[PDB]
């Protein structure tokens, strides 16, 4: 098995695994469009669903990518193996990332792997509104058919912003998982990452959706609340101080030689889901009013007029 295997599904997951291309080998690529392909993509690490025979995307249409992509799953699965931990990354305003990725967590997660998402929250219309909030209630459904917590680390499209700010901080939670998870360091065994993300083995919490932080100094992980199961890395042994009461907790030990940093926390809470429940709601508040004030003009069509077989009509 490879020690950490990279999903990228739909066009959001297209375009950061080109952008992080090169920052690992074991990376794969699932759509059901061929226009997203990218230079990096090649006939060995990329699957393609094509529909009744096209390929062409699913236009935010989440049910149908679902019933396309749904019966594809155990073979896509058996392609592209399970690493000793997964990594899967998508939209939730999408239609094929926001179906393909939770389908692969959740096959994955009975298999009994270890799997983490990256994801995006977007909702600039109705229908990608619609999306997001399908995709939050899909963790929650994911969570409760694997029997296994869904972990996603969050990432909102806020309006307005540059997507490519939001791109380069996954980046950055990519490159940091991706050294969390090399099995390089000191102290730090498969196991010991398994029980960090299985944290509901050894522990009374709902086995619900979880959310992932990943925290670049000591006080970026002491600001996240009721912490459930946090990871941590330091390049200086004498610097392991447990942060917060916590219920899991494991540490490794980076080389101080090769890493440039002080310490990594991965902290996974349940609390911060919330936060994105009510983002989502008050957007969908906002977006309900406004369609109830649409004004619906009169038809221009008279209870006098006729209509031709093919809807030809004459004044
Ligand atoms: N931050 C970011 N957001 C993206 C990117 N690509 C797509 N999105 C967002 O994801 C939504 C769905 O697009 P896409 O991921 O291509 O849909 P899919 O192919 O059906 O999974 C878009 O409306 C954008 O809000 C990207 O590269 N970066």
């Not at 996603?152 to 998870?181: C, D, K, R, T, W």
């Not at 000191?186 to 944290?199: C, E, G, P, Y």
């Amino acid at each position: 098995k490879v020690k950490t295997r990279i999903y990228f599904c739909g066009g959001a997951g297209f375009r950061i695994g080109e952008l992080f291309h090169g920052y690992h080998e074991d990376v794969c690529y699932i759509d059901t469009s061929v226009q997203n392909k990218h230079k990096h993509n090649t006939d060995d690490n990329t699957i393609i669903i094509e529909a009744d025979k096209r390929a062409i995307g699913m236009g935010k249409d989440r049910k149908a990518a679902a019933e396309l992509i749904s019966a594809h799953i155990p073979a896509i699965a058996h392609h592209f193996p399970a690493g000793d931990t997964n990594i899967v990354v998508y939209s939730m305003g999408g239609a094929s990332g926001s179906t393909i990725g939770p389908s692969l967590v959740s096959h994955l997660q009975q298999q009994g792997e270890v799997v983490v998402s990256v994801v995006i929250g977007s909702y600039d219309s109705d229908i990608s509104l619609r999306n997001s909030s399908g995709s939050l209630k899909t963790f929650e459904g994911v969570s409760s058919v694997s029997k296994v917590p869904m972990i996603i680390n969050y990432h909102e499209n806020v309006e307005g912003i540059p997507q490519s700010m939001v791109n380069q901080n996954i980046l950055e939670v990519l490159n940091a998982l991706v050294i969390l998870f090399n099995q390089e360091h000191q102290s730090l065994d498969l196991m010991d990452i398994t029980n960090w993300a299985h944290f509901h083995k050894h522990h009374d919490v709902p086995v619900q959706t979880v959310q992932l932080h990943v925290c670049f100094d000591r006080q970026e992980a002491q600001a996240i609340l009721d912490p459930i199961s946090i990871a941590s890395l330091y390049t200086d042994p004498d610097r392991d101080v447990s942060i917060s009461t916590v219920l899991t907790r494991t540490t490794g030990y980076a080389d101080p030689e090769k890493y440039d940093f002080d310490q990594m926390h991965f902290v996974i809470n349940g609390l911060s889901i919330e936060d994105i429940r009510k983002r989502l709601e008050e957007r969908r508040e906002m977006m309900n009013r406004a369609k109830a004030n649409m004004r619906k003009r009169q038809s221009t069509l008279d209870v006098d007029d006729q209509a031709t077989s093919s809807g030809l009509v004459f004044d």
